[PDB]
């Protein structure tokens, strides 16, 4: 019923890169995310003590979220973009695996995800 730590967006030893495929996940599959209407639920780590969600991360052992995103493409914790799109899955597929098909939160996060298929099938060629 706790939350866990949040996910790491620092890792000094971890090498890191700045390539114009992660820059295109910034301003483009990020921003394009982060705006919409139904972003709201995915911009930070889901906090299972205030949504009263007690199992939560007894089910979901991969947390990921908008917000952890964001903040590993400003601070540039990725090598490359594939990292990236694999958080962005990791961020779906947990809302898909914890809720009932038809939810609220589902609509939403297939809602971001078409719009996240739509920026990845144009991630520029290196
Ligand atoms: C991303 N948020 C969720 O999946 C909830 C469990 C609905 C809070």
Redesign the pocket.
Known sequence: SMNPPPPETSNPNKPKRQTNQLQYLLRVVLKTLWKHQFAW??QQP?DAVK?N?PD?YKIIKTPM?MGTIKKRLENNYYWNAQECIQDFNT?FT??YI??KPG???VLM?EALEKLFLQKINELPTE
Do not use: E, T
């Open positions: 639920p995915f889901v949504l969600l939560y979220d961020m947990n809302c914890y809720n939810d609220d939160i996060a």
